[PDB]
Design a protein around this nucleic acid. Structure first.
Ligand SMILES: [Mg+2]
Ligand SMILES: [Zn+2]
Lengths: 586, 49, 1341
DNA sequence: CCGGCTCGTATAATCTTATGTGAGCGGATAAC
DNA sequence: GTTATCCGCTCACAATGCCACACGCCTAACGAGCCGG
């Protein structure tokens, strides 16, 4: 670890107007970094002769220098870094956009990959300065080239909490609103109805949609129909590209739904529509999250009406078990077990009652009498969309909270009968402090142990590089989908997606070559292997690869974080050690 | 090479010493004292010590 | 009811329902009581310096009959008072005087009378005193000693099960921890042999340390075991029996008596058969002979006829020895009673393990354990074993050690010696054997009956005793050859090691920390701090996990929620609110004595051990007005476990609902609606809130900020009650009421408020007056608002209008948007104060000058300087300009032995000049507010230093003239009033000066003559004021001493003003951080239907994830407070009548359930009401106690009193589109802080800077103009891509290749992007220090 | 009139809340 | 007996990264210096 010239440090800040391949750079710090490029551009254009004239001109900060600096920036990328680097997405390269400020702006979709807060997290800046370094930082490391993760083939550009709330609030329905049941021409007329205030954002309506489907072999097929949908869904359809079918935006669109929206858009179309589609999603998600106005208030946490008598019946039952212990019929251990069972049952009943009271209380007039629907409550939209929180956190807010366990390892008799909307008294808060400090100490030591194990694994696997193409053997392993005895945990599709077959696995129709012996199990081919219900597939591993001083290519299969088979040189031992050692904190 | 264990320039008076320089000074003092004791036909107990 | 004269300025509306009975004590009591206990004239010498002088002295030579004894001690007056000591640089010391009496005897008579006694006041050392705020002053700065939490002196019986031998068998070690001395441990091996060790050496059998105190083996077996008596009947002998010994056994034979068969063979002995023997009362039964086949004879037996040793003590018996004792007639035979369950033969096995046999051999064996190779000699081993335990010099338990050691053995008295005894060690062995048997249990460590706190005075006297021991060794070595009758006891007491030890501990220990002066909260929570690190305790990487969790006896003694997080959690605990240090050093906490039915008000204090016997009610238990538990079963607790008890069963009740927490988290309103993690983060982030330009009270605060802001030191409090007589911006002069004047010449009071000066975190400590002229104040009331205070209320940040809504993504995870109205009202602007010094140094080649003559610089940079070489007071300078012009001589090669004579006198001491002027660092700016000049005694002062002299001299004249003018007027009134007697003429009086009134002739009464004598007494008082002025000017005029080498010092302060900008960190009191993302204009804000914009947009998504739900209740209550404020403002702008205003304030102050204030405005007499309205018109301040909060419905009714909506949600419009935000949003007033993680302390950059010396790498840090550490994991990351050339630049061109990097720099400036690889210089460094070992290492080819 | 004092400076000394490994070596331990 | 193993004791070696900040880094006695008594 050598310290490095042309570097810098700041605190960061969001800036949601950026594109994906650029970042906000402070003006003064960018004049400070690129001083020799500035000196060269000044002595080229005749505006100075010596180096000292250029030093005086750039210490006066004259108005020619900013135009010169903008000529210096234009196509010259910059590396950014966050300090506890775990996995290889820790440092990435962007282009700069100049900012009159003192902080670094940073595109919000990337912020999950850095695992960055905005709680005061600091970042650092390095400069590629030669020609090959600029060209590597543009090709191998620009942030439009890192969508899928190297640990598993999943997009790392999932839209986060606020965009989730915006898109979930746009694409819903309610059974009586302005302009319900009218008819429309395009999606743009639905937009023009939303702006004028004539029709509301979610009122059901038949529209006309043209959609393109590329089942024709390399071209697009138009198809025009009338579909029963929503004004918000017709507005969101205007940023979907040509490829996808309309049933991707007809549902309620929580978090996993838009994640697989991005994933199917990556599968069918390519790279550039995936990047530009993530940008349009981020922009319109923030826009309609602004126009929502989704607040939170103390009257958005509905207490159940039946909490009181459930606690009263639980107290009657524990008094009865206490009397059965007092007469001497039941021993102390079974008394303990009966009490913990009945408080578990009472907690589950209270949680069921509060969730049933929140999710569907909203009754609205039909233009007939009354109906039922999913609610428009605040925290229920914050949980049901999967933006922040689970059933557990929203359970502790209004229903009673769990059973706190003492640090000895036992679990206490009397559970915390209160929620957070009501007040906790002295003893119960003093009990909750145990779990607080226990979790904090566990995090404090877990960090260091994960760091040391990652250090040792990347020491082991460092000298190993994919070095030749085809070792050409006929060994390997046999994969079957794992089954404990409960449910099948991992199917055969997920494990043996993208690994090169060892032997020709025959069809269940015997003596029929279902797969050639030396091909790559890509996705369509994996489905056509799945259809005949194959239980065991033999496949080439790395542990039986033949190549001296390295690993052959077909013995490793396709690469993660990109699409095709792996190129000769990818230092797979280091990315493997990082992929094991990265989630060790969790 | 003595640039690779440099003598710390303080402000006012004396220079602050490193650790290697103190260890080499101790070794050289001990070596000179033993060489002089070999030069003067010392008794065996003292040269052993 | 009746309120103070500042308490009537505003009233905080107090919710909370419980009647309190005990107010908050003085929050800094522990520091002041400790250091007051340290230095005090103490009879009986149990503690303080007197104990340290009684422990060592008298000191005497090696029977040379020269001896030094001790008379008394005295502390000299401080030569320097506090503020100028903080300016100049020294400690706030105090000198010490010791009256020593050197005696020498007359020879051939040791009890003979001494012939020479010599008494002196020897000077030794300097002991630092304590400021009135509990702090110390060390090197110009102000430092605090943190209290320590360590293990108790005494004894412990730990188990430590598990990991030994992997068999599951537990162990039982017993440790004795002395207060000053050496350890003592007892252990078990899995062979059940009982071992001893001392000071963690190697193991020994405990039999030898039991023998070494003059014990025979039969005495050992008599003490540690009982007896069974066999009597030899001549055939098939008998056995005595108490039948309870047979319990839990298997009968080896047919147990029977009087023909009645009790137990058959093979049957285990039942308690039924035991009761049969109880009824039958059997004393003897008749065993078979072989039953003694395996037992052990207790004591030794010889042949009474021949002297043959038949069997010794602790011998395993056989039938041959039984036959021989029957032949010798030894019928009465003792036998060790053994068992596997109750009385285990544990000692006898160990006594058969050990090799060592008797007393002198035992002393030899211990003496060989302690030091190997030394000659085993009788007297040396005897002296070693005496000095380990049985002497005062090197084994001292305290009183606390004797306390715990008599308590943990069920003794009776609690006063014993500071040494051990025979009974102590054998009782430790007996108790350890009993614990191994099964009765009794272990003592867990985390329980606070075993962990004491050390305050400052005890650590101070320990270090002082260490220094006294070193000086004692030196003076004993000197006085051992004491043979001179001219020796006086200054010749022998070297005052260097005592001062070295005292200044070592107070200056740079591990427990002498800086005090964080950026809140009054930060100071008062840093002094109240209980630490577990340092000497005597553990370290932060060897503490495990059990000492960090919450033991269930932290209740009311240690705050559960205030702690640092990160590396050291649970070691730096903060002290509770009502906690008191015990008489011995444990932590006692208050409780209320309860009789049979009546909860009384007689408060008691309880230790950590006494609490686990009684029954204690929880605080919020509803009561009567007479005092009765109104329910029947009450939530209470007995021993670590809360439960539900009866009504005529409780004994003690809590004092208040505050006592669980500390002062750092009793200031969070609605704390009881928060997850404990976020309460921890809020309680950590309050004490980093930087102070603001204009301070501002909080609307929603707990009822605690008045005691915090007063009981700290940042505000000034009137000591005596009176009338305000003079108020300037600088000082306040108070006339004292005549009831509070002690009758000899009391007069007035003067408070000199501290102006803009430096704090330790470079923030601006300030004081301002808050009383008007001619206004009454009362004793114990505030006068000067310090930093972040407001009318005697702690007030850290400011409170603002906040809307919870997502606004265009500018608040994505935790970011905060701020409108420009917060900037234009400059209400987070912060003053900072930097300090820069410059010294003139006595180098070679000539000295250095402070002159204004600098070559190679322009005239314009010399303009801000005066002719003396120093910038003026108040010249607004920026980064780069010259503060102080200093020049250095530069020869370089002159070498003439005559030219240097003329250059040192005639040649100005200046031949060729190198510029070494103190310049402003880069970036920083500001306004020079203060310059200090310090000149060595001997150099003549420069004229600017003389200007400072004259200014300070006029300052010294002014105040003394003020006191003379105010003092002489009483005797002026007296000469006039006695001149009334006899005859006075007032028209003739006032035409001529006052001495002429004094010399106005009148017939001599006795009263006028005594008052004339008092007139010359004020004349000599005037002479005394003259000598006061002379005493001031001899201090000011005289030059300074300095460090060896320095001529003069110039100190320059600067002050700079920091506005707010995107990047700073603001955060509420509930743990909700944020970086200011954008800074919007006013018209892009969400405005409500009335038109007023909203200052700050938060993000709602942060509320359901982390359960900090109390902030929304704070938001609603704050909107209710400002809602009352707007109606009060509307009633004052219309200037309505005070009766209606009185009525509205009264109706706003009743409002709710059974609150305990009950104010009534029928005593405020139509002027306090208007002043109270002028204070309340910006909002009505509201109190909320922590665990006695305001319910939801009362917030609803207070929102109903104003015209606000009940739901707390208002329709909000849009700044950009002018449309409506559809659902209603939440607006309110939240109180926010500004933390000192400012962006202009972090944004740091580098293109090409400096380099280090050893390896040619760039330096690190911001100040040294460094580059970032592109560390190891980032290299793994670049290897993980296909990046190859970029790794080569980050490894070689950017650093450690010298020719490579200069070639690269020239190549960039030329406009060609190539590179030159080279080879790093640090690798050649690695080669040159591997070759420094015996390792050849080269490079092939 | 040399060092008594006073200084320049070169250089020696009586803990005590940790865990988990591996790895080796000395003392007991069970056979022809 | 004597030989090939088994077991308990003692001891070296590891424990994330980065940042700021701040204050610390000898002297009683052996070879010289000044000049007083
Ligand atoms: Mg963060
Ligand atoms: Zn292979």
């Amino acid at each position: 670890g050598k310290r490095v010239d042309y570097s810098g440090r700041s605190v960061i800040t969001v800036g949601p107007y950026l594109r994906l391949h650029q970042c906000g750079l402070p003006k003064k710090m960018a004049l400070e970094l690129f001083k020799p490029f500035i000196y060269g551009k000044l002595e080229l254009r005749g505006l100075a002769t010596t180096i000292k004239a250029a030093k005086k001109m750039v210490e006066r900060e004259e108005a020619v220098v900013w135009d010169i600096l903008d000529e210096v920036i234009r196509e010259h990328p910059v590396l950014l870094n966050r300090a506890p680097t775990l996995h290889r997405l820790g440092i990435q390269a962007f282009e700069p956009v100049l900012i009159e400020g003192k902080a670094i702006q940073l595109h919000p979709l990337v912020c999950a990959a850095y695992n960055a807060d905005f709680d005061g997290d600091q970042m650092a800046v390095h400069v590629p300065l030669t020609l090959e370094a600029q060209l590597e930082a543009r090709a191998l490391m620009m942030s439009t080239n890192n969508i899928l993760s190297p640990a598993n083939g999943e997009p790392i550009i999932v839209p986060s909490q606020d965009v989730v709330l915006g898109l979930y609030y746009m694409t819903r329905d309610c059974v009586n609103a302005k302009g319900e049941g009218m008819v429309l021409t395009g999606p743009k007329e639905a937009e023009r109805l939303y702006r004028s205030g004539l029709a509301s954002l979610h009122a059901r309506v038949k529209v006309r949609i043209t959609e393109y489907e590329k089942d024709a072999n390399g071209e697009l097929v138009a198809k025009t129909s009338l579909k029963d949908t929503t004004v918000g869904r017709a507005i969101l359809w205007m940023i979907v590209p040509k490829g996808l079918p309309y049933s991707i935006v007809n549902q309620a669109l929580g978090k996993k739904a838009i994640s697989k929206m991005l994933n199917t858009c990556y599968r069918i179309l390519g790279l550039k529509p995936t990047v530009i589609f993530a940008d349009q999603i981020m922009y319109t998600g923030f826009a309609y999250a602004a126009r929502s106005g989704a607040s939170v208030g103390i009257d958005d946490m509905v207490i159940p009406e039946k909490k009181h008598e459930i606690i009263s019946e639980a107290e009657a039952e524990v008094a009865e078990i206490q009397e059965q212990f007092q007469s001497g019929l039941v021993t102390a251990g079974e008394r303990y077990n009966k009490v913990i069972d009945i408080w578990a049952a009472a907690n589950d009943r209270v949680s069921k009652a509060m969730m049933d009271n929140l999710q569907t209380e909203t009754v609205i007039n039909r233009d007939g009498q009354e109906e039922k629907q999913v609610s428009f409550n605040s925290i229920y939209m914050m949980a049901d969309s999967g933006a922040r929180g689970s059933a557990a956190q929203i359970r502790q807010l209004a229903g009673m909270r769990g059973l706190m366990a003492k640090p000895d390892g036992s679990i206490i008799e009397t559970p915390i009968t209160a929620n957070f909307r009501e007040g906790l008294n002295v003893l119960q808060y003093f009990i909750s402090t145990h779990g607080a400090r226990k979790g904090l100490a566990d995090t404090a030591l877990k960090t260091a142990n994960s760091g040391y194990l990652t250090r040792r694994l990347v020491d082991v696997a460092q000298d190993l590089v994919v070095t030749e193409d085809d070792c050409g053997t006929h060994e390997g392993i046999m994969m079957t989908p794992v089954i404990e005895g409960g449910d099948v945990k991992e199917p055969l599709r997920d494990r043996v997606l993208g690994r090169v077959t060892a032997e020709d696995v025959l069809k269940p129709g015997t003596a029929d070559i279902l797969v050639p012996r030396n091909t790559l199990l890509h996705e369509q081919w994996c489905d056509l292997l799945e259809e005949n219900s194959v239980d065991a597939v033999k496949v080439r591993s790395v542990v039986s690869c033949d190549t001296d001083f390295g690993v052959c290519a077909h013995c490793y299969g396709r690469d993660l974080a990109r699409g095709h088979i792996i190129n000769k040189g990818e230092a797979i031992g280091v990315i493997a050690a990082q992929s094991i050692g990265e989630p060790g904190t969790q | 090479p003595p640039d690779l264990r440099p003598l710390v320039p303080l402000d006012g008076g004396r220079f602050a010493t490193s650790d290697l320089n103190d260890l080499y000074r101790r070794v050289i003092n001990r070596n000179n004292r033993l060489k002089r004791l070999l030069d003067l036909a010392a008794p065996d107990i003292i040269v052993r010590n | 009811m009746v309120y103070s004269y500042t308490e009537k300025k505003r009233i905080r509306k107090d919710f909370g329902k419980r009647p309190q009975v005990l107010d908050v004590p003085y929050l800094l009591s522990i520091q002041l009581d400790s250091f007051q206990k340290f230095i005090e004239q103490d009879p009986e010498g149990q503690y303080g310096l007197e104990a340290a002088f009684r422990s060592v002295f008298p000191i005497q030579s090696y029977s040379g009959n020269s001896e030094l004894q001790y008379v008394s001690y005295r502390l000299g007056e401080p030569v320097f008072d506090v503020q100028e000591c903080q300016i100049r640089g020294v400690t706030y010391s105090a000198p010490l005087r010791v009256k020593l009496r050197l005696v020498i005897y007359e020879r051939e008579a040791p009890e003979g009378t001494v012939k020479d006694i010599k008494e002196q006041e020897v000077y030794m050392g300097e002991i630092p005193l304590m400021t009135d705020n509990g702090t110390f002053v060390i090197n110009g700065t102000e430092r605090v000693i943190v209290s320590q939490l360590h293990r108790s002196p005494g004894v412990f019986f730990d188990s430590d099960k598990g990991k030994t031998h992997s068999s599951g068998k537990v162990l039982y070690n017993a440790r004795i921890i002395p207060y000053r001395g050496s350890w003592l441990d007892f252990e078990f091996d899995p062979k059940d042999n009982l071992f001893v060790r001392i000071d963690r050496r190697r193991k020994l059998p405990a039999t030898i340390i039991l023998r070494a105190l003059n014990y025979t083996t039969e005495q050992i077996l008599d003490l540690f075991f009982e007896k069974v008596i066999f009597e030899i009947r001549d055939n098939k002998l008998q056995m005595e029996l108490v039948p309870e010994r047979l319990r839990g056994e298997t009968a080896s034979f047919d147990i029977e008596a009087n023909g009645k068969v009790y137990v058959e063979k093979g049957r285990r002995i039942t308690a039924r058969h035991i009761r049969q023997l109880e009824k039958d009362d059997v004393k003897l039964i008749e065993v078979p002979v072989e039953y003694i086949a395996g037992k052990v004879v207790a004591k030794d037996y010889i042949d009474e006829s021949t002297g043959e040793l038949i069997c010794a003590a602790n011998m395993e018996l056989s039938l041959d020895l039984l036959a021989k004792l029957s032949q010798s007639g030894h019928k009465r035979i003792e036998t060790l009673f053994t068992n596997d369950l109750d009385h285990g033969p544990y000692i006898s096995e160990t006594l058969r393990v050990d090799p060592t046999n008797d007393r002198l051999s035992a002393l030899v064996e211990i003496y060989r354990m302690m030091r190997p190779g030394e000659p085993p000699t009788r007297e040396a081993a005897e002296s070693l074993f005496e000095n380990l335990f049985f002497s005062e010099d090197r084994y001292d338990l305290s009183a606390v050690g004797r306390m715990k050691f008599n308590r943990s053995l069920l003794r009776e008295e609690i006063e014993g010696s500071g040494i051990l005894s025979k009974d102590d060690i054998i009782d430790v062995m007996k108790k350890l054997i009993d614990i191994r048997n099964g009765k009794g249990e272990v003592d867990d460590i985390d329980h606070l009956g075993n962990r004491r706190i050390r305050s400052v005075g005890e650590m101070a006297e320990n270090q002082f005793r260490v220094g006294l021991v070193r000086v004692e060794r030196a003076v004993k070595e000197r006085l051992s050859l004491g043979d001179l009758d001219t020796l006086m006891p200054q010749d022998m007491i070297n005052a260097k090691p005592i001062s070295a030890a005292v200044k070592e501990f107070f200056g740079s220990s591990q427990l002498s920390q800086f005090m964080d002066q950026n809140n009054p909260l930060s100071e008062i929570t840093h002094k109240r701090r209980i630490s577990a690190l340092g000497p005597g305790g553990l370290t932060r990487e060897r503490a495990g996990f059990e000492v960090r969790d919450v033991h269930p006896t932290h209740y009311g003694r240690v705050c559960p929620i205030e702690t640092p997080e990160g590396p050291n959690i649970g070691l730096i605990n903060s002290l509770s609110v009502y906690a008191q240090t015990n008489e011995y050093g444990f932590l006692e906490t208050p409780y209320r004595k309860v009789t049979d039915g009546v909860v009384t008000d007689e408060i008691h204090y309880l230790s950590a051990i006494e609490e686990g016997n009684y029954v204690i009610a929880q605080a919020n238990s509803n009561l009567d007005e007479e005092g009765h538990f109104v329910e029947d079963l009450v939530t209470c607790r007995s021993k670590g476990e809360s439960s539900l008890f009866s009504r005529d069963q409780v004994d003690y009740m809590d004092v208040s609902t505050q006592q669980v927490v500390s002062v750092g988290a009793s200031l969070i309103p609605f704390l009881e609606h928060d997850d404990a993690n976020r309460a921890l983060m809020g309680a950590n982030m309050q004490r980093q809130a930087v102070p603001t330009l204009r301070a501002d009270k909080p609307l929603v605060g707990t009822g605690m900020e008045r005691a915090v802001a007063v009981d700290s030191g940042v505000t000034a409090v009137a000591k005596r009650g009176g009338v305000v007589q003079y108020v300037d911006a600088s000082r306040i002069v108070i006339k004292v009421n005549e009831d509070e004047m002690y009758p000899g010449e009391a007069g007035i009071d003067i408070y000199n408020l501290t102006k803009y000066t430096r704090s330790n975190q470079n923030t601006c400590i300030n004081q301002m007056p808050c009383v008007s002229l001619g206004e009454p104040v009362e004793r114990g009331d505030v006068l000067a608002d310090g930093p972040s205070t407001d009318l005697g209320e702690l007030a850290l940040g400011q409170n603002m209008r906040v809307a919870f809504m997502p606004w265009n993504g500018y608040n994505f995870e935790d970011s905060i948007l701020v409108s420009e109205r917060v900037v234009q009202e400059d209400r987070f602007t912060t003053i900072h104060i930097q300090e820069l010094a410059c010294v003139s140094r006595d180098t070679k080649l000539g000295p250095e000058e402070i002159t204004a003559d600098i070559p190679n610089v322009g005239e314009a940079a010399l303009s801000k300087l005066d002719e003396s070489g120093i910038v003026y007071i108040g010249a607004e300078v920026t980064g780069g300009d010259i503060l102080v012009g200093k020049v250095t001589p530069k020869g370089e090669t002159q070498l003439t032995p005559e030219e240097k004579l003329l250059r040192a006198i005639f040649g100005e001491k200046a031949s060729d000049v190198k510029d070494s002027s103190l310049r402003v660092p880069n970036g920083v700016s500001g306004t020079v507010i203060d310059v200090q000049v310090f000149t060595r005694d001997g150099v003549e002062k420069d004229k600017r230093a003389l200007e400072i002299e004259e200014m300070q001299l006029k300052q010294a004249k002014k105040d003394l003239s003020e006191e003379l003018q105010i003092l002489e007027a009483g005797l002026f009134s007296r000469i006039r009033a006695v001149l009334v007697a006899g005859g006075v003429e007032a028209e003739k009086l006032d035409k001529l000066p006052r001495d002429r009134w004094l010399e106005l002739g009148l017939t001599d009464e006795e009263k006028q003559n005594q008052l004339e004598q008092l007139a010359e007494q004020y004349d000599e008082l005037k002479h005394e004021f003259e000598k006061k002025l002379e005493a001031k000017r001899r201090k000011i005029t005289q030059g300074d001493d300095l460090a060896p080498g320095v001529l003069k010092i110039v100190k320059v302060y600067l002050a700079v003003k920091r506005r707010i900008q995107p990047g700073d960190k603001m955060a509420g009191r509930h743990g909700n951080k944020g970086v200011i993302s954008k800074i919007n204009p006013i018209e892009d804000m969400p405005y409500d239907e009335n038109g007023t914009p909203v200052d700050i947009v938060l993000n709602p998504l942060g509320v359901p994830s982390r359960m900090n739900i109390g902030q929304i209740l704070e938001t609603h209550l704050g909107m209710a407070a400002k809602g009352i404020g707007d109606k009060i403002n509307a009633m004052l702008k219309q200037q309505q009548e005070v009766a209606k205003l009185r009525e509205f304030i009264q109706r706003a102050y009743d409002l709710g359930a059974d609150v305990r204030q009950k104010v009534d405005l029928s005593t405020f007499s139509d002027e306090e009401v208007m002043r109270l309205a002028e204070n309340l018109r910006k909002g009505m301040p509201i109190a909320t106690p922590v665990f006695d909060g305001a319910k939801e419905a009362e917030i609803k009714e207070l929102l109903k009193l104003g015209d606000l909506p009940t739901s707390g949600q208002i329709r909000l419009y849009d700044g950009r589109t002018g449309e409506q935000f559809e659902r209603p949003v939440t607006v309110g007033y939240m109180y926010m802080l500004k933390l000192n993680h400012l962006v202009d302390d972090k944004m740091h950059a580098r293109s090409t800077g400096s380099y280090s010396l050893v390896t040619q790498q760039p330096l690190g840090g911001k100040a040294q103009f460094g580059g970032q550490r592109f560390g190891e994991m980032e290299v793994w990351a670049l290897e993980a891509y296909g990046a190859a050339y970029t790794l080569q630049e980050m490894l070689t061109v950017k650093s450690d290749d010298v020719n490579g990097r200069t070639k690269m720099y020239k190549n960039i400036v030329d406009g060609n992007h190539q590179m030159e690889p080279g080879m790093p210089e640090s690798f050649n460094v690695l080669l040159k220090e591997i070759r420094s070992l015996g390792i050849n290492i080269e490079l092939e080819d």
